[PDB]
Write an enzyme that holds these catalytic residues in place. Structure first.
Site, PDB file in Angstrom:
ATOM      1  CG  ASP A 121       0.081  19.323  16.568  1.00  0.00           C
ATOM      2  OD1 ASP A 121       1.130  19.628  16.016  1.00  0.00           O
ATOM      3  OD2 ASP A 121      -0.991  19.345  15.953  1.00  0.00           O
ATOM      4  CB  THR A 159       0.575  17.798  12.138  1.00  0.00           C
ATOM      5  OG1 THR A 159       0.724  19.076  12.768  1.00  0.00           O
ATOM      6  CG2 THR A 159       0.067  16.816  13.167  1.00  0.00           C
ATOM      7  CG  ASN A 180      -0.338  18.720   7.403  1.00  0.00           C
ATOM      8  OD1 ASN A 180      -0.039  17.601   7.886  1.00  0.00           O
ATOM      9  ND2 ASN A 180      -0.218  19.857   8.096  1.00  0.00           N
ATOM     10  CG  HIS A 265      -1.350  27.138  13.660  1.00  0.00           C
ATOM     11  ND1 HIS A 265      -0.581  27.384  12.544  1.00  0.00           N
ATOM     12  CD2 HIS A 265      -1.298  25.800  13.869  1.00  0.00           C
ATOM     13  CE1 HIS A 265      -0.071  26.249  12.106  1.00  0.00           C
ATOM     14  NE2 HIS A 265      -0.483  25.274  12.896  1.00  0.00           N
ATOM     15  CG  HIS A 309       5.569  20.566  13.907  1.00  0.00           C
ATOM     16  ND1 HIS A 309       4.975  21.643  14.530  1.00  0.00           N
ATOM     17  CD2 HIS A 309       4.563  19.761  13.491  1.00  0.00           C
ATOM     18  CE1 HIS A 309       3.657  21.508  14.469  1.00  0.00           C
ATOM     19  NE2 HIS A 309       3.384  20.384  13.829  1.00  0.00           N
ATOM     20  CG  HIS A 420       4.106  23.928  11.969  1.00  0.00           C
ATOM     21  ND1 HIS A 420       3.839  22.768  11.269  1.00  0.00           N
ATOM     22  CD2 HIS A 420       2.957  24.270  12.596  1.00  0.00           C
ATOM     23  CE1 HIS A 420       2.592  22.397  11.498  1.00  0.00           C
ATOM     24  NE2 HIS A 420       2.033  23.289  12.302  1.00  0.00           N
ATOM     25  CG  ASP A 683      20.539   9.402  -5.680  1.00  0.00           C
ATOM     26  OD1 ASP A 683      20.088   8.327  -6.190  1.00  0.00           O
ATOM     27  OD2 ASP A 683      20.010  10.011  -4.727  1.00  0.00           O
ATOM     28  CG  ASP A 687      17.324   5.546  -5.092  1.00  0.00           C
ATOM     29  OD1 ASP A 687      18.478   6.047  -5.099  1.00  0.00           O
ATOM     30  OD2 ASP A 687      17.160   4.341  -5.348  1.00  0.00           O
TER      31      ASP A 687
HETATM   32  C1  LIG Z   1      14.449   4.352   4.086  1.00  0.00           C
HETATM   33  O1  LIG Z   1      14.015   3.028   4.467  1.00  0.00           O
HETATM   34  C2  LIG Z   1      13.193   2.375   3.530  1.00  0.00           C
HETATM   35  C3  LIG Z   1      12.722   1.029   4.099  1.00  0.00           C
HETATM   36  O2  LIG Z   1      13.834   0.163   4.280  1.00  0.00           O
HETATM   37  C4  LIG Z   1      13.950   2.203   2.207  1.00  0.00           C
HETATM   38  O3  LIG Z   1      12.979   1.886   1.214  1.00  0.00           O
HETATM   39  C5  LIG Z   1      13.021   0.549   0.671  1.00  0.00           C
HETATM   40  O4  LIG Z   1      14.010   0.435  -0.340  1.00  0.00           O
HETATM   41  C6  LIG Z   1      14.053  -0.678  -1.223  1.00  0.00           C
HETATM   42  C7  LIG Z   1      14.977  -0.314  -2.409  1.00  0.00           C
HETATM   43  O5  LIG Z   1      14.546   0.878  -3.087  1.00  0.00           O
HETATM   44  C8  LIG Z   1      12.655  -1.095  -1.729  1.00  0.00           C
HETATM   45  O6  LIG Z   1      12.791  -2.426  -2.198  1.00  0.00           O
HETATM   46  C9  LIG Z   1      11.968  -2.679  -3.369  1.00  0.00           C
HETATM   47  O7  LIG Z   1      10.757  -3.347  -3.020  1.00  0.00           O
HETATM   48  C10 LIG Z   1       9.880  -3.652  -4.091  1.00  0.00           C
HETATM   49  C11 LIG Z   1       8.572  -4.185  -3.508  1.00  0.00           C
HETATM   50  O8  LIG Z   1       8.122  -3.166  -2.643  1.00  0.00           O
HETATM   51  C12 LIG Z   1       6.777  -3.347  -2.134  1.00  0.00           C
HETATM   52  O9  LIG Z   1       6.703  -4.150  -0.950  1.00  0.00           O
HETATM   53  C13 LIG Z   1       7.246  -3.596   0.253  1.00  0.00           C
HETATM   54  C14 LIG Z   1       7.128  -4.619   1.403  1.00  0.00           C
HETATM   55  O10 LIG Z   1       5.944  -4.508   2.190  1.00  0.00           O
HETATM   56  C15 LIG Z   1       5.844  -5.602   3.139  1.00  0.00           C
HETATM   57  O11 LIG Z   1       6.777  -5.543   4.210  1.00  0.00           O
HETATM   58  C16 LIG Z   1       6.889  -6.736   4.997  1.00  0.00           C
HETATM   59  C17 LIG Z   1       8.280  -7.345   4.791  1.00  0.00           C
HETATM   60  O12 LIG Z   1       9.277  -6.399   5.163  1.00  0.00           O
HETATM   61  C18 LIG Z   1       5.724  -7.727   4.758  1.00  0.00           C
HETATM   62  O13 LIG Z   1       5.668  -8.699   5.786  1.00  0.00           O
HETATM   63  C19 LIG Z   1       4.376  -6.986   4.675  1.00  0.00           C
HETATM   64  O14 LIG Z   1       3.345  -7.890   4.314  1.00  0.00           O
HETATM   65  C20 LIG Z   1       4.438  -5.750   3.743  1.00  0.00           C
HETATM   66  O15 LIG Z   1       3.461  -5.787   2.721  1.00  0.00           O
HETATM   67  C21 LIG Z   1       6.602  -2.225   0.552  1.00  0.00           C
HETATM   68  O16 LIG Z   1       7.195  -1.590   1.664  1.00  0.00           O
HETATM   69  C22 LIG Z   1       6.663  -1.268  -0.649  1.00  0.00           C
HETATM   70  O17 LIG Z   1       6.003  -0.059  -0.267  1.00  0.00           O
HETATM   71  C23 LIG Z   1       6.200   1.075  -1.160  1.00  0.00           C
HETATM   72  O18 LIG Z   1       5.230   1.204  -2.205  1.00  0.00           O
HETATM   73  C24 LIG Z   1       3.873   1.488  -1.834  1.00  0.00           C
HETATM   74  C25 LIG Z   1       3.092   1.962  -3.069  1.00  0.00           C
HETATM   75  O19 LIG Z   1       3.919   1.933  -4.234  1.00  0.00           O
HETATM   76  C26 LIG Z   1       3.705   2.541  -0.709  1.00  0.00           C
HETATM   77  O20 LIG Z   1       2.563   2.246   0.079  1.00  0.00           O
HETATM   78  C27 LIG Z   1       4.895   2.709   0.253  1.00  0.00           C
HETATM   79  O21 LIG Z   1       4.839   4.023   0.796  1.00  0.00           O
HETATM   80  C28 LIG Z   1       6.268   2.410  -0.385  1.00  0.00           C
HETATM   81  O22 LIG Z   1       6.603   3.481  -1.268  1.00  0.00           O
HETATM   82  C29 LIG Z   1       8.011   3.839  -1.329  1.00  0.00           C
HETATM   83  O23 LIG Z   1       8.882   2.871  -1.959  1.00  0.00           O
HETATM   84  C30 LIG Z   1       8.667   2.664  -3.374  1.00  0.00           C
HETATM   85  C31 LIG Z   1       9.553   1.541  -3.936  1.00  0.00           C
HETATM   86  O24 LIG Z   1       9.171   0.322  -3.329  1.00  0.00           O
HETATM   87  C32 LIG Z   1       8.807   3.984  -4.154  1.00  0.00           C
HETATM   88  O25 LIG Z   1       8.506   3.781  -5.521  1.00  0.00           O
HETATM   89  C33 LIG Z   1       7.901   5.071  -3.541  1.00  0.00           C
HETATM   90  O26 LIG Z   1       8.148   6.336  -4.112  1.00  0.00           O
HETATM   91  C34 LIG Z   1       8.080   5.214  -2.023  1.00  0.00           C
HETATM   92  O27 LIG Z   1       9.310   5.873  -1.792  1.00  0.00           O
HETATM   93  C35 LIG Z   1       6.121  -1.968  -1.920  1.00  0.00           C
HETATM   94  O28 LIG Z   1       4.707  -2.087  -1.879  1.00  0.00           O
HETATM   95  C36 LIG Z   1      10.590  -4.626  -5.030  1.00  0.00           C
HETATM   96  O29 LIG Z   1       9.722  -4.940  -6.089  1.00  0.00           O
HETATM   97  C37 LIG Z   1      11.884  -3.977  -5.557  1.00  0.00           C
HETATM   98  O30 LIG Z   1      12.597  -4.854  -6.430  1.00  0.00           O
HETATM   99  C38 LIG Z   1      12.728  -4.335  -7.790  1.00  0.00           C
HETATM  100  O31 LIG Z   1      13.861  -3.491  -7.997  1.00  0.00           O
HETATM  101  C39 LIG Z   1      15.173  -4.075  -8.072  1.00  0.00           C
HETATM  102  C40 LIG Z   1      15.977  -3.248  -9.088  1.00  0.00           C
HETATM  103  O32 LIG Z   1      16.933  -4.009  -9.810  1.00  0.00           O
HETATM  104  C41 LIG Z   1      15.274  -5.602  -8.361  1.00  0.00           C
HETATM  105  O33 LIG Z   1      15.996  -6.236  -7.308  1.00  0.00           O
HETATM  106  C42 LIG Z   1      13.959  -6.377  -8.600  1.00  0.00           C
HETATM  107  O34 LIG Z   1      14.126  -7.282  -9.678  1.00  0.00           O
HETATM  108  C43 LIG Z   1      12.730  -5.478  -8.829  1.00  0.00           C
HETATM  109  O35 LIG Z   1      12.719  -4.987 -10.169  1.00  0.00           O
HETATM  110  C44 LIG Z   1      11.506  -5.359 -10.890  1.00  0.00           C
HETATM  111  O36 LIG Z   1      10.417  -4.450 -10.726  1.00  0.00           O
HETATM  112  C45 LIG Z   1      10.504  -3.157 -11.331  1.00  0.00           C
HETATM  113  C46 LIG Z   1       9.077  -2.632 -11.476  1.00  0.00           C
HETATM  114  O37 LIG Z   1       8.933  -1.501 -10.649  1.00  0.00           O
HETATM  115  C47 LIG Z   1      11.197  -3.111 -12.708  1.00  0.00           C
HETATM  116  O38 LIG Z   1      11.836  -1.863 -12.869  1.00  0.00           O
HETATM  117  C48 LIG Z   1      12.232  -4.211 -12.973  1.00  0.00           C
HETATM  118  O39 LIG Z   1      12.513  -4.280 -14.359  1.00  0.00           O
HETATM  119  C49 LIG Z   1      11.760  -5.546 -12.391  1.00  0.00           C
HETATM  120  O40 LIG Z   1      10.565  -5.977 -13.024  1.00  0.00           O
HETATM  121  C50 LIG Z   1      12.772  -3.489  -4.387  1.00  0.00           C
HETATM  122  O41 LIG Z   1      13.389  -4.549  -3.679  1.00  0.00           O
HETATM  123  C51 LIG Z   1      11.567  -1.024  -0.640  1.00  0.00           C
HETATM  124  O42 LIG Z   1      10.252  -1.227  -1.142  1.00  0.00           O
HETATM  125  C52 LIG Z   1      11.608   0.292   0.134  1.00  0.00           C
HETATM  126  N1  LIG Z   1      10.643   0.284   1.236  1.00  0.00           N
HETATM  127  C53 LIG Z   1       9.898   1.313   1.658  1.00  0.00           C
HETATM  128  C54 LIG Z   1       8.966   1.050   2.836  1.00  0.00           C
HETATM  129  O43 LIG Z   1       9.934   2.441   1.156  1.00  0.00           O
HETATM  130  C55 LIG Z   1      14.642   3.480   1.774  1.00  0.00           C
HETATM  131  O44 LIG Z   1      15.525   3.157   0.712  1.00  0.00           O
HETATM  132  C56 LIG Z   1      15.414   4.175   2.923  1.00  0.00           C
HETATM  133  N2  LIG Z   1      15.950   5.436   2.421  1.00  0.00           N
HETATM  134  C57 LIG Z   1      17.269   5.698   2.446  1.00  0.00           C
HETATM  135  C58 LIG Z   1      17.727   7.014   1.871  1.00  0.00           C
HETATM  136  O45 LIG Z   1      18.109   4.899   2.937  1.00  0.00           O
HETATM  137  C1  LIG Z   2      -0.130   9.135  12.733  1.00  0.00           C
HETATM  138  C2  LIG Z   2      -0.496   9.881  11.477  1.00  0.00           C
HETATM  139  C3  LIG Z   2      -1.015  11.291  11.745  1.00  0.00           C
HETATM  140  C4  LIG Z   2      -2.324  11.274  12.610  1.00  0.00           C
HETATM  141  C5  LIG Z   2      -2.314  12.533  13.566  1.00  0.00           C
HETATM  142  N1  LIG Z   2      -3.076  12.256  14.860  1.00  0.00           N
HETATM  143  C6  LIG Z   2      -4.348  12.779  15.203  1.00  0.00           C
HETATM  144  C7  LIG Z   2      -4.965  13.869  14.330  1.00  0.00           C
HETATM  145  C8  LIG Z   2      -5.011  12.392  16.352  1.00  0.00           C
HETATM  146  C9  LIG Z   2      -4.424  11.496  17.325  1.00  0.00           C
HETATM  147  O1  LIG Z   2      -4.952  11.116  18.361  1.00  0.00           O
HETATM  148  N2  LIG Z   2      -3.075  11.030  16.980  1.00  0.00           N
HETATM  149  C10 LIG Z   2      -2.141  10.206  17.678  1.00  0.00           C
HETATM  150  C11 LIG Z   2      -1.038  10.068  16.813  1.00  0.00           C
HETATM  151  C12 LIG Z   2       0.201   9.372  17.017  1.00  0.00           C
HETATM  152  C13 LIG Z   2       1.133   9.267  15.958  1.00  0.00           C
HETATM  153  C14 LIG Z   2       2.344   8.578  16.146  1.00  0.00           C
HETATM  154  C15 LIG Z   2       2.573   8.038  17.377  1.00  0.00           C
HETATM  155 CL1  LIG Z   2       4.042   7.126  17.609  1.00  0.00          CL
HETATM  156  C16 LIG Z   2       1.666   8.154  18.445  1.00  0.00           C
HETATM  157  C17 LIG Z   2       0.472   8.831  18.266  1.00  0.00           C
HETATM  158  N3  LIG Z   2      -1.222  10.777  15.634  1.00  0.00           N
HETATM  159  C18 LIG Z   2      -2.441  11.373  15.765  1.00  0.00           C
HETATM  160 CA   LIG Z   3       1.704  19.303  14.278  1.00  0.00          CA
HETATM  161 CA   LIG Z   4      20.188   6.146  -6.764  1.00  0.00          CA
END
Ligand SMILES: *[C@@H]1O[C@H](CO)[C@@H](O[C@@H]2O[C@H](CO)[C@@H](O[C@@H]3O[C@H](CO[C@H]4O[C@H](CO[C@H]5O[C@H](CO)[C@@H](O)[C@H](O)[C@@H]5O)[C@@H](O)[C@H](O[C@H]5O[C@H](CO)[C@@H](O)[C@H](O)[C@@H]5O[C@H]5O[C@H](CO)[C@@H](O)[C@H](O)[C@@H]5O)[C@@H]4O)[C@@H](O)[C@H](O[C@H]4O[C@H](CO)[C@@H](O)[C@H](O)[C@@H]4O[C@H]4O[C@H](CO)[C@@H](O)[C@H](O)[C@@H]4O)[C@@H]3O)[C@H](O)[C@H]2NC(C)=O)[C@H](O)[C@H]1NC(C)=O
Ligand SMILES: CCCCCn1c(C)cc(=O)n2cc(-c3ccc(Cl)cc3)nc12
Ligand SMILES: [Ca+2]
Ligand SMILES: [Ca+2]
Ligand SMILES: [Ca+2]
Ligand SMILES: [Cl-]
Ligand SMILES: [Cl-]
Ligand SMILES: [Cl-]
Ligand code: NA
Ligand SMILES: [Zn+2]
EC number: 3.1.4.39
Length: 808
Positions: A121, A159, A180, A265, A309, A420, A683, A687
């Site tokens: 860290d 962190t 954080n 710190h 960081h 930081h 955009d 997103d």
């Molecule tokens: C950086 O990389 C990441 C990862 O690749 C990129 O992010 C991805 O980008 C995709 C496009 O934006 C997005 O696709 C979505 O997915 C929707 C379902 O998403 C949920 O499920 C995800 C899968 O989890 C599982 O993973 C594996 C398989 O890979 C399984 O085996 C496991 O069992 C897992 O469960 C999941 O990751 C996702 O997590 C997000 O949401 C959670 C809580 O909301 C959070 O815990 C988590 O942090 C994630 O949050 C982020 O992403 C969401 C958006 O998903 C965002 O809102 C948050 O702010 C945050 O940023 C979910 O739980 C799927 O439904 C989508 O499809 C809809 O949209 C299109 C649009 O036309 C249609 O094709 C489709 O019909 C559908 O529309 C319908 O639904 C809408 C209702 O909302 C409605 O408007 C419409 O009318 C329709 O009804 C779409 O495919 C990915 O989810 C996303 N993944 C992640 C991890 O973020 C990212 O883009 C990259 N960045 C850059 C700049 O390149």
């Molecule tokens: C991961 C989310 C933040 C948790 C921070 N945190 C703390 C407080 C204790 C501790 O033992 N660890 C170890 C790691 C860690 C995170 C990523 C990788 Cl690849 C390997 C180790 N993070 C924590």
């Molecule tokens: Ca730190």
């Molecule tokens: Ca966009």
């Protein structure tokens, strides 16, 4: 409730955590108040300390001891790490010469080289040089293995966002740990560093490495350690796990140190009190390596030494107070410190107004040490907007400063000399990366890279398929001796049309005019060749970009530039041109000032029109290929084609005109020619991804001409600047930007001055990776080079940062 009257007998640091109310014996039970009654006694032994001494050699096994020096300790996997040094005449690992590890040298029954992630860290990148005298174990890892001069963290450089980015390969906006401290309005719940809410799984998105490994049949050590478990015990626990039978033994492990962040710190990054924490971390590394050597694993394990960081000088007296700017300070909630996030104190207050808050915070004091943004206006390179946990109002705080709501928050919440969290491009926020082992290269330096890239490589090291993430897989192949991932270029989805002359001038009714009616057999053979693409090899140096989505577009050739013109958005998706070192800048002739010309290759129906710009009193227009850089007076007419025109706010045209008239020529001068690719970005839902047509929120009044949120340029030349950009035999050099297309220049506090005082500074703030532009446009660049694809992936992840030299 926990029934804490069970027992840790034979369960110390067990790998699968048991469910409540049964008592736990894993490395996190402390943090949960859930360890069995006898955890300390059985699992956290301390007797006799951590080192073997002469007189303990061959001792009778006493189970009370922290670690052992008895003859059976190797078989039991629980010797002190210095056992063979003291008792068996062995040397410490740091005292051995380094020897290339060409192949993994592992005990029988090891199916793959294990991976150990040693995370520290607050380990600022310059500690590697500045503290080198007191870190001999770390220095040996660094010089014998593979290292970068620094590794770029993600924003904010705190962190939890960075450690979880390390674990997932995701930006904080996607994994959800966006600071954080957080409020989620959908849960109506708050996440904090202290407390139980952070343990709830709903905060943590994506798929961290230990879960990726488990799902694919690779066993993982538990990554997290309760604060009170001492470092020496963390190490002994890892080493004991490594002595488990083959079917029980994990393949991936993490060690974590709270230092040097904890001291940084209190004392500042280079406080004299910082030497000791650095010595101590190095000693822990020495303990690990000696312990691996004992187990015959020191030429088998891949070790990653990685920070989250750095650390900057920051004191109480460098705090800006929102109470000096706003009258209404009680109607706001601030997340304070090295970044600022603002929201209404009450959602029942419909007098709260963000527009007035931002205006009250904008260029109000001549030395102001923070700049307010709506989150969608933050530099796209930060990727910090697409999450409901990120407040609409953001303050980017100058390095060395804090922001707070009121002075009382600072003296009743000095106490600290380091912090930081600042912009991830800041030198003091950079951190470290070293990889050492059979799978890493020998004595190899690699360029700086971003920590979002590591999850992919960690998956490669363990033979795992990464979950979908923000790394660019293959961009770090150059770190590895073997296990490289061999990516293929994405397939082009849409092929272009190549329109010839198809429309007469009188078919267009665009309300445009040009004074171009004054005008051979010589240069009309010529003009035809140019429209057929005769100069295309000069202006399109790396192939045409590939369009990776379904659309309708035309390739248009000209003497000085080539474009991909979208019949859907009515403007180019990209415009490509090469400016040699010798090129000259000219002006726009007076009679051509308002000239716009129908393009007889493209139908009226797929063309913009000048009347819309006349009627839209907010919106004007600019050109993608700049008329100032035309190769001849006749070629200049091509720059006024309606197909080279893009909508631009007048305030933005100041920025754009200066880039085109002054800066492109400056770069060609400095870089020995440049190739430029420019275009629009849409955009509207911030997103980071190309908008479809039905997401566009703004059009040129009365028309279907969509207004871009941003304009990009990608500026490439030869890394060996003794060669011109258009005759380059080897590696390339790139810088890029994504400028926000704004109707005012409020972001630039000096904008009433000459563009020469503020424009280039704005552009540098909005520096970008080619990859950022790919996500935003659905284009894929550099399709036709003589370079290896892995090298091209590295180039596409490069960020030109404009900081001075790290270390100085
Ligand atoms: C950086 O990389 C990441 C990862 O690749 C990129 O992010 C991805 O980008 C995709 C496009 O934006 C997005 O696709 C979505 O997915 C929707 C379902 O998403 C949920 O499920 C995800 C899968 O989890 C599982 O993973 C594996 C398989 O890979 C399984 O085996 C496991 O069992 C897992 O469960 C999941 O990751 C996702 O997590 C997000 O949401 C959670 C809580 O909301 C959070 O815990 C988590 O942090 C994630 O949050 C982020 O992403 C969401 C958006 O998903 C965002 O809102 C948050 O702010 C945050 O940023 C979910 O739980 C799927 O439904 C989508 O499809 C809809 O949209 C299109 C649009 O036309 C249609 O094709 C489709 O019909 C559908 O529309 C319908 O639904 C809408 C209702 O909302 C409605 O408007 C419409 O009318 C329709 O009804 C779409 O495919 C990915 O989810 C996303 N993944 C992640 C991890 O973020 C990212 O883009 C990259 N960045 C850059 C700049 O390149
Ligand atoms: C991961 C989310 C933040 C948790 C921070 N945190 C703390 C407080 C204790 C501790 O033992 N660890 C170890 C790691 C860690 C995170 C990523 C990788 Cl690849 C390997 C180790 N993070 C924590
Ligand atoms: Ca730190
Ligand atoms: Ca966009
Ligand atoms: Ca206008
Ligand atoms: Cl925060
Ligand atoms: Cl202006
Ligand atoms: Cl530095
Ligand atoms: Na921290
Ligand atoms: Zn810290």
């Amino acid at each position: 409730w926990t029934a804490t009257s069970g027992s840790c007998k034979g369960r110390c640091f067990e790998l699968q955590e048991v469910g409540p109310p049964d008592c736990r014996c894993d490395n996190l039970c402390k943090s949960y108040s859930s360890c069995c009654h006898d955890f300390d006694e059985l699992c956290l032994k301390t007797a006799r300390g951590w080192e073997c001494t002469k007189d303990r050699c061959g001792e009778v096994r006493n189970e009370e001891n922290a670690c052992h020096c008895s003859e059976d300790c190797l078989s039991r996997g629980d010797c002190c790490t210095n056992y063979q040094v003291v008792c068996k005449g062995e040397s410490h690992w740091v005292d051995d010469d380094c020897e290339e590890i060409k192949v993994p040298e592992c005990p029988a029954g090891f199916v793959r080289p294990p991976l150990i992630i040693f995370s520290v860290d607050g380990f600022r990148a310059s500690y590697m040089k500045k503290g080198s005298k007191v870190m001999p174990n770390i220095e040996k890892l660094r010089s014998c293995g593979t290292h970068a001069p620094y590794m770029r963290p993600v924003y904010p450089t705190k962190t939890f966002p960075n450690l979880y980015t390390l674990a997932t390969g995701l930006y904080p906006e996607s994994h959800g740990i966006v600071g954080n401290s957080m409020y989620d309005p959908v849960f109506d719940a708050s996440f904090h560093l202290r407390g139980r809410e952070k343990f709830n799984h709903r905060w943590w998105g994506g798929q961290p490495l230990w879960i990726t490994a488990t799902k694919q049949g690779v066993r993982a050590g538990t990554f997290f350690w309760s604060v009170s478990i001492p470092h020496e015990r963390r190490i002994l626990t890892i080493l004991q796990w490594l002595s488990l039978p083959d079917n029980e033994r994990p393949s991936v492990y993490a060690f974590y140190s709270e230092q040097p962040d904890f001291s940084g710190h209190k004392y500042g990054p280079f406080g004299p009190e910082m030497t000791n924490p650095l010595r101590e971390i190095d000693k822990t590394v020495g303990q690990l390596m000696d312990g691996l050597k004992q187990l015959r694993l020191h030429r088998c394990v891949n070790v990653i030494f990685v920070g989250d960081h750095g650390m900057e000088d920051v004191t109480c007296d460098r705090t800006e107070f929102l109470s000096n700017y706003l009258t209404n300070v009680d109607d706001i909630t601030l997340v304070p410190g090295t970044l600022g996030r603002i929201r209404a104190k009450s959602i029942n207050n419909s007098k709260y107004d963000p527009k007035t808050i931002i205006a009250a915070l904008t260029c109000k004091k001549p030395d102001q040490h923070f700049k307010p943004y709506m989150k969608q206006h933050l530099p796209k390179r930060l990727h910090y907007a697409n999450n409901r946990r990120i407040e609409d109002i953001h303050l980017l705080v100058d390095r060395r400063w804090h922001v707070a709501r009121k002075p009382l928050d600072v003296y009743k919440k000095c106490f600290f000399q380091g912090d930081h969290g600042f912009d991830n491009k800041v030198n003091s926020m950079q951190t470290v990366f070293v990889g050492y082992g059979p799978t890493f290269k020998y004595r190899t330096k690699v360029p700086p890279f971003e920590n979002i890239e590591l999850y992919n490589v960690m998956c490669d090291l363990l033979g795992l398929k990464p979950a979908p993430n923000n790394g660019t897989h293959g961009s770090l192949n150059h770190l590895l001796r073997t296990n490289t991932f061999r990516p293929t270029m994405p397939d082009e989805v849409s092929r272009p049309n190549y329109p010839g002359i198809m429309y007469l001038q009188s078919e267009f009714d665009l309300g445009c005019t040009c004074d171009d009616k004054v005008e051979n057999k010589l240069e009309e053979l010529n003009k035809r060749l140019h429209t057929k693409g005769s100069t295309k090899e000069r202006h399109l140096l790396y192939g045409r970009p590939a369009v990776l989505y379904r659309t309708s577009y035309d390739i248009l050739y000209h003497t000085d530039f080539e474009s991909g013109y979208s019949e859907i958005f009515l403007m180019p998706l990209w415009t490509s041109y090469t400016i040699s070192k010798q090129a000259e800048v000219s002006s726009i002739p007076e009679h051509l000032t308002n000239c716009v010309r129908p393009d007889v290759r493209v139908s009226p129906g797929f063309s913009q029109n000048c009347l819309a710009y006349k009627n839209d009193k907010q919106m004007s227009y600019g050109f993608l290929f700049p008329p100032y850089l035309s190769s001849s007076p006749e070629a200049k007419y091509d720059a006024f084609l309606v197909t080279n025109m893009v909508p631009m706010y007048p305030a933005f045209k100041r920025v754009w005109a200066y880039f085109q008239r002054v800066l492109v020529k400056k770069y060609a001068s400095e870089r020995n020619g440049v190739n430029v690719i420019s275009g629009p970005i849409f955009d509207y839902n911030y997103d980071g991804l190309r908008d479809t047509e039905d997401e566009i929120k703004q059009y040129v009044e009365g028309s279907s001409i969509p207004v871009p949120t941003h304009y990009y340029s990608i500026i490439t030349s030869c890394l060996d600047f003794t060669q011109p950009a258009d005759k380059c035999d080897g590696p390339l050099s790139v810088s890029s930007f994504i400028l926000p297309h704004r109707p005012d220049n409020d972001e630039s506090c000096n904008s009433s001055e000459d563009e020469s005082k503020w424009v280039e500074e704005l552009m540098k703030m909005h520096t970008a990776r080619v990859r950022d532009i790919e996500h935003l446009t659905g284009l894929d660049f550099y399709r036709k080079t003589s370079r290896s694809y892995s090298e091209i992936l590295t180039l596409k992840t490069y960020l030109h940062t404009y900081e001075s030299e790290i270390g100085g």
